[PDB]
């Protein structure tokens, strides 16, 4: 009680001190400046909403004695929030419950009391037409319930709060979404509640109804308004279809919603990765290595362990499927001591020309490759290890026996070592002849690839592209032309005085 | 003082990285550590060391002796300012702030050095302060802070000639260019070996001779080797005291191929044990191999593969697997035959290989400017 009575009373007012300045500013700005004014010219409450997600992702941890969050819900749920003469008392009501926390004892919300903290779209003239107020005032209690999750009998409280937010969401889908950003502002709130929705209501229970309801939410997109419903409703569509085995990869090929037109650098950046693993499981033919690479390069700056360690793995999985491999051990910051050793230990065997060294990897870490689930892509690398081998030996040796290459490749059979070489001439790779009667495989010395018309194509790929980045440095450039206020010619008074001086020169 | 201060860090290397060899290094490193007032740089070296449980009074007598030098500075700063000389506060700790640089960490060094940098109006003190910042910039491997005071250093030598401040400086840029894997610049900073002196950091001049020959044997070709390191009287007589390095250098020059690997295991093994070559002993000899291979192999065309075992180095299958990874590695310009048992060569005109580095640098700078172009303007 001294240690609690001196360290517990300061964490109610200072979070109140900052939350009367951030999302009470969003309460005064996104309710009165998005529901009633234009927010397309000023949409800063979406990035402020990003701030009031990322702060509260790591703001709350404890079970909240001293009612430091447990007393916020009997405060923050009694909100009319209609107009300034009705919220002028509410600005006092941000203070009148501080006396309830400090002077008295409030309702300690500990896994049981979330029921009287949700049945307020009715208490004291509350509504639902102001869905910038009722979706933000839905999410503002819908987040901190589910931010720590509390999987002990809170799933139904979170569930019923999601049902009230589904009443706000059906009102969003049906009722008066024209020119108010009612749909646009709550596609971000809808999008962000799809992940708490999708981390209580996905892997516990029954996602396949959120499939049909999500195709209804995708159905109400693309007709009325062409933004914010084309973007999140496709990765949020994809994220368990990649974990499923339905045909929804070719539907994503023939989809019109593949471009949601500058999807905010966060869903768009990961979207290219999620469609990168699509052609991974459907046989990368070097098509999606640029979209995996682009999916890597459009990342922000937070951490790497969630997705970036897996695009740093899968991005050159698909190049190990090609035959090229960059070194992965680069900016050793968190990812290159923790999450490489089985997987760089994989490509160490691929960059060699050994056959069962690959097996010495794949018995050592077959289960770690099944921990993420890339194992069905790892299993087919023996083809590219042996094409690496036949390119290595066909490039190194010139007149080499077939009765040597099987033993050096520990193939244990020369009789198909004629045949791996045979398909190595079939598929392209190595060209020259085999003396099957003698045994030696001859290979010609092919030099002066210079005159052969490959490096003109290596030019021509990058000529037009460097002109493209020149053109982007031209087109992303003429917006700071602005405020060019007045190019005055000379003057008026000095021009009349110059005419008077020329008049004196004409009189003289 | 910072003049024996490189041997300290080299013996920290001798403590940490040889795992079995960590007993006499923590004996003599303590023999230097818990005297001469050293306080800060060995707490984590004590963590890598054993417990050494009662070090408390050992730290107390030396933070006390450190407090003595601190408080006599605190007895100097007010007498210095009463009747002022050339800012005698910063004239006292412009000399004792290097004592604070060794004893304290880099902070009481740096604020006093950038402090006293504005005091002396000539570079005769400034450039030595900057030499001190360079030397601690090696110590904490301050790879960004060395880039500043190298240019800020070199900006002072142009007025005057200052060859004890330029040729001495070239030793610092040479040790940086061999700290990084920049060998052709390391030997080029090690070009003179005449004005280079019986140093503090290489107290043997002959160790500097070994370093410049070990980098020069990669760094230059035969013309430079058949004029430069073979006709220098200043370079011959100092390896006249060396039996090994004289044989290790001349065996490549006298085409003594089989004995070259013998001293190659010696010099490479010493390079494995050595500080500052331990980052690149693995990269050194794999250059030495392909150099010694290409030198012999660009003489003949019809030279067989079972000739090099008895005349060059034993193990025919060892030569097989060693050349296969080099032709397959994309260098060592030849083409080996197998079952008629002969090694063929070719010759590439500088039209493809000179082009390969062009597409490398083009892809590098295209990655650079495209990455920056994605960064700026969102």
């Amino acid at each position: 009680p001294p240690g609690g009575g001196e360290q517990e009373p300061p964490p109610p007012p200072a979070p109140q001190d900052v939350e009367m300045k951030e999302e009470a500013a969003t309460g005064g700005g996104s309710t009165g400046e998005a529901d009633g004014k234009t927010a397309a010219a000023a949409a800063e409450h979406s990035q402020r909403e990003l701030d009031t997600v990322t702060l509260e992702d790591i703001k709350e941890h404890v079970k909240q004695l001293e009612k430091a969050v447990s007393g916020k819900e009997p405060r923050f749920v009694l909100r009319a929030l209609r107009m300034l003469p009705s919220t002028s008392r509410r600005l006092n009501h941000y203070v009148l419950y501080k006396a309830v926390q400090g002077f008295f004892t409030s309702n300690n919300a500990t896994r049981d009391f979330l029921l009287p903290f949700l049945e307020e779209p009715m208490d004291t003239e509350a509504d639902l037409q102001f869905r910038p107020r009722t979706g933000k005032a839905a999410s503002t209690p819908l987040l901190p319930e589910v931010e720590a999750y509390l999987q002990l009998l809170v799933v139904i409280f979170m569930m019923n709060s999601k049902r009230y937010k589904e009443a706000q969401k059906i009102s969003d889908d049906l009722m008066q979404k024209i020119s108010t950003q009612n749909r646009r502002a709550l596609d971000l709130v809808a999008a962000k509640c799809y992940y708490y929705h999708a981390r209580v209501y996905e892997f516990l229970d029954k996602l396949d109804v959120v499939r049909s309801f999500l195709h209804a939410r995708l159905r109400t997109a693309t007709l009325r308004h062409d933004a914010d419903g084309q973007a999140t409703l496709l990765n949020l569509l994809l994220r368990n279809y990649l974990h499923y085995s339905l045909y929804d990869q070719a539907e994503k090929l023939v989809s019109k919603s593949v471009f949601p037109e500058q999807a905010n650098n966060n869903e768009w950046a990961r979207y290219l990765y999620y469609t990168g693993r699509i052609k991974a499981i459907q046989l990368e033919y070097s098509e999606a290595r640029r979209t995996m690479t682009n999916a890597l390069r459009k990342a922000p700056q937070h951490t790497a362990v969630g997705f970036k360690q897996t695009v740093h793995k899968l991005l050159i999985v698909v190049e190990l499927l090609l035959g090229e491999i960059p070194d992965r051990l680069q900016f050793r910051q968190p990812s290159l001591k923790r999450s490489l050793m089985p997987y760089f230990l994989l490509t160490q065997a691929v960059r060699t020309g050994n056959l069962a060294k690959f097996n010495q990897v794949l018995d050592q870490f077959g289960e770690k490759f099944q921990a993420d689930g890339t194992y069905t892509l790892i299993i087919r690398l023996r083809h590219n290890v042996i094409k690496t081998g036949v390119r290595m030996i066909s490039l190194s040796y010139s007149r080499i026996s077939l009765a040597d290459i099987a033993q050096k490749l520990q193939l244990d059979s020369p009789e198909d070592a004629e045949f791996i070489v045979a398909k190595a001439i079939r598929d392209g790779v190595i060209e020259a002849s085999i003396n099957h009667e003698k045994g030696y495989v001859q290979s010609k010395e092919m030099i002066d690839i210079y005159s052969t018309r490959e490096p003109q194509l290596a030019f021509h790929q990058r000529i037009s592209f460097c002109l493209d980045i020149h053109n982007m440095s031209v087109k992303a450039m003429r917006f700071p032309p602005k405020s060019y206020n007045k190019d005055l010619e000379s003057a008026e008074e000095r021009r009349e005085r110059e005419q008077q001086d020329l008049e004196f020169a004409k009189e003289m | 003082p910072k003049n024996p201060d490189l041997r300290i860090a080299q013996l920290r290397f001798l403590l940490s990285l040889p795992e079995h060899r960590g007993d006499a290094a923590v004996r003599d490193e303590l023999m230097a550590a818990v005297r001469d007032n050293n306080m800060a740089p060995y707490y984590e070296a004590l963590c890598k060391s054993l417990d050494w449980q009662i070090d408390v009074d050992l730290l107390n007598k030396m933070k006390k002796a450190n407090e003595d030098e601190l408080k006599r500075l605190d007895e100097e700063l007010e007498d210095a300012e009463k009747n002022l000389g050339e800012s005698e506060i910063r004239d006292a700790m412009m000399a004792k702030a290097e004592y604070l640089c060794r004893i304290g960490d880099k902070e009481g060094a740096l604020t006093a050095f950038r402090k006293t940098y504005d005091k002396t109006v000539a570079l005769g003190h400034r450039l030595d302060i900057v030499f001190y910042l360079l030397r601690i910039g090696l110590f904490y491997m301050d790879n960004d802070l060395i880039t500043r005071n190298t240019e800020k250093a070199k900006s002072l030598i142009e007025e005057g000639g200052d060859w004890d401040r330029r040729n001495r400086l070239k030793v610092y840029q040479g040790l940086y260019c061999v700290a990084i894997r920049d060998f052709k610049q390391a030997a080029e900073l090690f070009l003179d070996t005449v004005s280079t002196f019986t140093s503090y950091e290489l107290m043997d001049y002959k160790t500097f001779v070994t370093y410049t020959v070990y980098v020069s044997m990669i760094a230059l070709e035969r013309p430079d080797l058949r004029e430069k390191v073979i006709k220098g009287a200043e370079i011959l007589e100092v390896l006249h005291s060396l039996p090994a390095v004289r044989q290790y250098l001349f065996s490549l020059y006298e085409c003594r191929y089989s004995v070259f690997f013998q001293s190659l295991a010696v010099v490479e093994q010493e390079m494995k044990k050595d500080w500052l070559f331990a980052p690149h002993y693995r990269y050194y000899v794999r250059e030495m191999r392909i150099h010694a291979y290409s030198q012999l192999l660009e003489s003949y065309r019809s030279l067989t593969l079972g000739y090099m075992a008895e005349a060059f180095g034993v193990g025919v299958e060892f030569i097989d697997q060693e050349l296969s990874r080099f032709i397959a590695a994309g260098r060592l310009h030849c083409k080996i035959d197998k079952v008629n048992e002969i090694v063929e060569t070719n010759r590439p005109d500088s039209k493809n290989w000179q082009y390969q580095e062009t597409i490398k640098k083009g892809d590098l700078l295209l990655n650079r400017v495209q990455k920056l172009s994605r960064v700026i303007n969102m």
């Binding site: 000529i463 460097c466 002109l467 980045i469 450039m477 700071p480 | 083009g362 400017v369 920056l372 700026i376």
Partner: peptide, 30 residues
């Protein structure tokens, strides 16, 4: 390929010469 590689960098330097005319002008004048 060389001169084509130089030109885009030239216009990038010209872009930064315009962003310096954007951000240090909009706060000053308004």
């Amino acid at each position: 390929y060389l001169a084509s590689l130089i030109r885009s960098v030239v216009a990038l330097h010209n872009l930064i010469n315009n962003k310096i005319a954007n951000r240090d002008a909009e706060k000053k004048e308004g």
